[PDB]
Amino acid sequence: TAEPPGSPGAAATWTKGDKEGVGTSLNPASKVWYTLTEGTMSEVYYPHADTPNTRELQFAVSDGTSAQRESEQTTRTVELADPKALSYRQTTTDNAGRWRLTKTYVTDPRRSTVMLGVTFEVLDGGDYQLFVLSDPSLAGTSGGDTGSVTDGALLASDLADAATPVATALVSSVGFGAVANGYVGTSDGWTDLAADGRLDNASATAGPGNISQTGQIPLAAGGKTEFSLALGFGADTAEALATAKASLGTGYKKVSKSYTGEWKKYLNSLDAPATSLTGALRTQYDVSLMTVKSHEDKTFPGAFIASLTIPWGQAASAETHREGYHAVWARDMYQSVTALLAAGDEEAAARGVEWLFTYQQQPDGHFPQTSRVDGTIGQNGIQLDETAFPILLANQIGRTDAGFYRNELKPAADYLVAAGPKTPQERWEETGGYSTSTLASQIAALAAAADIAGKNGDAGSAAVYRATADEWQRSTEKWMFTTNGPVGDGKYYLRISATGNPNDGATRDWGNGAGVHPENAVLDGGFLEFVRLGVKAPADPYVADSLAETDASISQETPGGRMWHRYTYDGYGEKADGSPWDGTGIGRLWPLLSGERGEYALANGQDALPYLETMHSAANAGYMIPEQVWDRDEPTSYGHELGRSTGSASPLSWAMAQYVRLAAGVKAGAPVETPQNVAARYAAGTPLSSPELSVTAPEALSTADSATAVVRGTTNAAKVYVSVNGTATEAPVTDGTFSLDVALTGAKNKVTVAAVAADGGTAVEDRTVLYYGSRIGALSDPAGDDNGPGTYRYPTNSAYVPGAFDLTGVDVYDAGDDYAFVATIAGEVTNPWGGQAISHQRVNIYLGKGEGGATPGLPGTNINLEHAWDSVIVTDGRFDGAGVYAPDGTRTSAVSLLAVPEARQIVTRVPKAALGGLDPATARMSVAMFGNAESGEGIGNVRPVYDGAYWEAGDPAWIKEWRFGGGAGVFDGTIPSRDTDTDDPNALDVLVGEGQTQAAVLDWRAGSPVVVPMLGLQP
Ligand SMILES: [Ca+2]
Ligand SMILES: [Ca+2]
Ligand SMILES: [Ca+2]
Ligand SMILES: [Ca+2]
Ligand SMILES: [Ca+2]
Ligand SMILES: [Ca+2]
């Protein structure tokens, strides 16, 4: 087969996020969504709202000598063709006024076809040729497409993905004259026409690769010709052609009417907006409502993508699958259904809630950062507000049935309780810690979950959720309201704190090229979520002092009204020269924040209409509200306009949604999505008492001795509930005291203690309990003991953190099939040299029965044990040198090493069988801590100790840098010991029993090798 020149086609990109309009039928049968960009049709989605298939479809007109692209005509307009439907009309006029093209878009509600009603008028003596230029990017990729011709139609496909096969068919109601396929940048229609105003390439086939199709439209005799084009989609070519023809078969006028009628009927069936919405604000409402609606998938009803666009797509390559904003974000979806809910579309919210918990929720209960419309995980960051919003959606909708509560709601709420108040990522998806914005959703979600749990008879989980939410709610100011910020009076809620001390001036890099700034200096309107979600009263005083400074720092007055940047120094936007964001740049204005300020104003009884006015001034002629609008008077080399959409997403369903939701709030006189049960508790009048609660045991962190742990203390509350990892059990209160042996359910047990007063007030306490099984026995050892006989020194190198070789205890647990030998150290448990759990420590635990007398330990050890040993446990996560060893050096069994730095523990799992019938419960044992080393550094992988003075000298340098000092001897590379004196023990410390001391037991000058006492585990 002869392919036209250009293979495989030029590298391509997507389109700018700034859309003039978008559209889809209300009918779920039509699996197509179209977008418009600068006078052309940009990306069209199919079969799911998360898959773009087009880059550009526009017309070219020639006289026979020269040709022009309508995207080159400085004179073109866009306008919504119907005030009650998502149908747009683009008009292109020749710069010389010789011809005029009029295009009106619509889709066939019954099948996946995008239709274009076209009128071409020659205003000259005539004699012009008209060509359609359709450049696809099927299945979300510019490459991999194959263009062909059949039965007078232009065909294209990319079936490289079995789960998402895509093919199209461009058909002309009047057929085509000349038809051609080629490779972009060489044999494509425009490159061709530009050459000589003629279609020289006649090749009817091209690809796979980046191709484009071109079809000449036969013009009627006279000035104007009216016709229509149908772009049908299908799993295959035959399906696509058939769908397109079925559309033309019905006709543009008929299809147009049907499409426009569904939308009109949809709007007319929903709640009537406030009478105070003037014409323009009403149309903005109608278009915003439909647009939000159009972001729901047709194959997975209930799934809403953030936006049918790719921000800065002109700079985003299309060779590989990209996510853009055409993916599902729980947060953005929450904004969407909450808007449809405000407008009166209950079913969309029901499908939505069902979709979230069925398809996107993860087995652990939380919601992924992003996902495909089928639930397939996209980004994997942890945003706690994305787990809280779906709970709030179910709370609002009443989706509270026992089954849904136990299997859906509880796991999500339990995750929140387990995650703690700090979110690893806040709503802007960039950093973590105590977030005003996220903590507001966390508190509201748990407060709501509490009522749902209670309503379902689960008092334990209710107390846990309420007590937790209550504590975070009363800690809002302590954690995030700074009092020494470098702006205004210095008193305001900051954006996020890493420590929970808003006055510590802790810094961090804020990404996107913003650099390092103290948290004290970063202002963010996220605190407004507190009143919006009923977490604080509308007139809360703290939210009030945040206003002035926040406005000064990130607000600005545009001609349409006041607007806000997300936060101080935000760099997520175009660069100073106007070029698209590419990892760094400068954040612009977010119109949705005006809608947010408006809900806060409304909640306080003020007129919110002006905020709607401001939100609408950010829209284009098509009424598309963008994520961002330019904030400078200077239009860089790019055509940026103050108050107009930038290169990012437009429309942003979220911004569209925020406009509708506020509008509804205006009609009701108060924000309509605020959770009533949550506001009743925190935003109403009279506050509640907080009962006293004192948990005396356990401590913040501990290790249990069995499958149960004693949880006790004092309180003046009526009831107390002790919950571990989501399992709550009541603790009966007796004369202000309580005490319960609660069951441990995991290796790590998060224990929440909730105290509930007779009037409803709560107090909470959290404790963490580590569990390895029933404790056989233990051995203790003093800290600051890591100096051998009392003269040893750590090797100067940094890696050797202090206390690394300082044992503080040894605990043995019966762990079912294994024995868990837990060693605790004073120093931090590191693992830099990349090893199993640890790198530096080499502890030995010689097990025996106290028989015989002095018996040598392992080779490079340089020590003896008080009595004979049957086996020794080597804890060395280096060189696979760990396990239980017989006295002859034979490793009788492998072992697993786990590090628990939080507890400064080093766990060694030893299968019971490894200790051939030697029960540690009645065995004698010696414990010694050495430093691991390479064979070439000393016998048996033990880092030797050398003369103190010799070491102090530092000759060579590696001795005082990577070896122990204060013992005896110098380096000798001729013998395996590498030490010229192995009389001194290489143990930096060991365990001794009563009446004896480490200084005497390790005193090698008074005897060598030293004899380490054989001890017994105390129960
Ligand atoms: Ca492709
Ligand atoms: Ca292409
Ligand atoms: Ca689920
Ligand atoms: Ca010690
Ligand atoms: Ca030595
Ligand atoms: Ca010791």
Automatic annotation (TrEMBL):
<feature type="binding site">
    <location>
        <position position="989"/>
    </location>
    <ligand>
        <name>Ca(2+) 4</name>
    </ligand>
</feature>
<feature type="binding site">
    <location>
        <position position="979"/>
    </location>
    <ligand>
        <name>Ca(2+) 6</name>
    </ligand>
</feature>
<dbReference type="GO" id="GO:0004553">
    <property type="term" value="F:hydrolase activity, hydrolyzing O-glycosyl compounds"/>
</dbReference>
<keyword id="KW-0732">Signal</keyword>
<dbReference type="InterPro" id="IPR014718">
    <property type="entry name" value="GH-type_carb-bd"/>
</dbReference>
<dbReference type="GO" id="GO:0046872">
    <property type="term" value="F:metal ion binding"/>
</dbReference>
<feature type="binding site">
    <location>
        <position position="143"/>
    </location>
    <ligand>
        <name>Ca(2+) 2</name>
    </ligand>
</feature>
<feature type="binding site">
    <location>
        <position position="785"/>
    </location>
    <ligand>
        <name>Ca(2+) 5</name>
    </ligand>
</feature>
<feature type="binding site">
    <location>
        <position position="158"/>
    </location>
    <ligand>
        <name>Ca(2+) 2</name>
    </ligand>
</feature>
<feature type="binding site">
    <location>
        <position position="211"/>
    </location>
    <ligand>
        <name>Ca(2+) 1</name>
    </ligand>
</feature>
<keyword id="KW-0326">Glycosidase</keyword>
<feature type="binding site">
    <location>
        <position position="135"/>
    </location>
    <ligand>
        <name>Ca(2+) 1</name>
    </ligand>
</feature>
<feature type="binding site">
    <location>
        <position position="408"/>
    </location>
    <ligand>
        <name>Ca(2+) 3</name>
    </ligand>
</feature>
<keyword id="KW-0479">Metal-binding</keyword>
<feature type="binding site">
    <location>
        <position position="945"/>
    </location>
    <ligand>
        <name>Ca(2+) 6</name>
    </ligand>
</feature>
<feature type="binding site">
    <location>
        <position position="998"/>
    </location>
    <ligand>
        <name>Ca(2+) 5</name>
    </ligand>
</feature>
<feature type="binding site">
    <location>
        <position position="210"/>
    </location>
    <ligand>
        <name>Ca(2+) 1</name>
    </ligand>
</feature>
<feature type="binding site">
    <location>
        <position position="357"/>
    </location>
    <ligand>
        <name>Ca(2+) 3</name>
    </ligand>
</feature>
<keyword id="KW-0106">Calcium</keyword>
<dbReference type="Pfam" id="PF09136">
    <property type="entry name" value="Glucodextran_B"/>
</dbReference>
<comment type="similarity">
    <text>Belongs to the glycosyl hydrolase 15 family.</text>
</comment>
<dbReference type="InterPro" id="IPR012341">
    <property type="entry name" value="6hp_glycosidase-like_sf"/>
</dbReference>
<dbReference type="Pfam" id="PF09137">
    <property type="entry name" value="Glucodextran_N"/>
</dbReference>
<dbReference type="InterPro" id="IPR008928">
    <property type="entry name" value="6-hairpin_glycosidase_sf"/>
</dbReference>
<dbReference type="GO" id="GO:0030246">
    <property type="term" value="F:carbohydrate binding"/>
</dbReference>
<feature type="binding site">
    <location>
        <position position="984"/>
    </location>
    <ligand>
        <name>Ca(2+) 6</name>
    </ligand>
</feature>
<feature type="region of interest" description="Disordered">
    <location>
        <begin position="1"/>
        <end position="23"/>
    </location>
</feature>
<feature type="binding site">
    <location>
        <position position="141"/>
    </location>
    <ligand>
        <name>Ca(2+) 2</name>
    </ligand>
</feature>
<feature type="binding site">
    <location>
        <position position="806"/>
    </location>
    <ligand>
        <name>Ca(2+) 4</name>
    </ligand>
</feature>
<feature type="binding site">
    <location>
        <position position="968"/>
    </location>
    <ligand>
        <name>Ca(2+) 6</name>
    </ligand>
</feature>
<feature type="binding site">
    <location>
        <position position="145"/>
    </location>
    <ligand>
        <name>Ca(2+) 2</name>
    </ligand>
</feature>
<dbReference type="Pfam" id="PF09985">
    <property type="entry name" value="Glucodextran_C"/>
</dbReference>
<feature type="binding site">
    <location>
        <position position="781"/>
    </location>
    <ligand>
        <name>Ca(2+) 4</name>
    </ligand>
</feature>
<dbReference type="InterPro" id="IPR019248">
    <property type="entry name" value="Glucodextran_C"/>
</dbReference>
<feature type="binding site">
    <location>
        <position position="781"/>
    </location>
    <ligand>
        <name>Ca(2+) 5</name>
    </ligand>
</feature>
<feature type="binding site">
    <location>
        <position position="782"/>
    </location>
    <ligand>
        <name>Ca(2+) 4</name>
    </ligand>
</feature>
<dbReference type="InterPro" id="IPR015220">
    <property type="entry name" value="Glucodextranase_N"/>
</dbReference>
<feature type="binding site">
    <location>
        <position position="807"/>
    </location>
    <ligand>
        <name>Ca(2+) 4</name>
    </ligand>
</feature>
<feature type="binding site">
    <location>
        <position position="138"/>
    </location>
    <ligand>
        <name>Ca(2+) 2</name>
    </ligand>
</feature>
<protein>
    <submittedName>
        <fullName>Glucodextranase</fullName>
    </submittedName>
</protein>
<dbReference type="GO" id="GO:0016757">
    <property type="term" value="F:glycosyltransferase activity"/>
</dbReference>
<dbReference type="InterPro" id="IPR014756">
    <property type="entry name" value="Ig_E-set"/>
</dbReference>
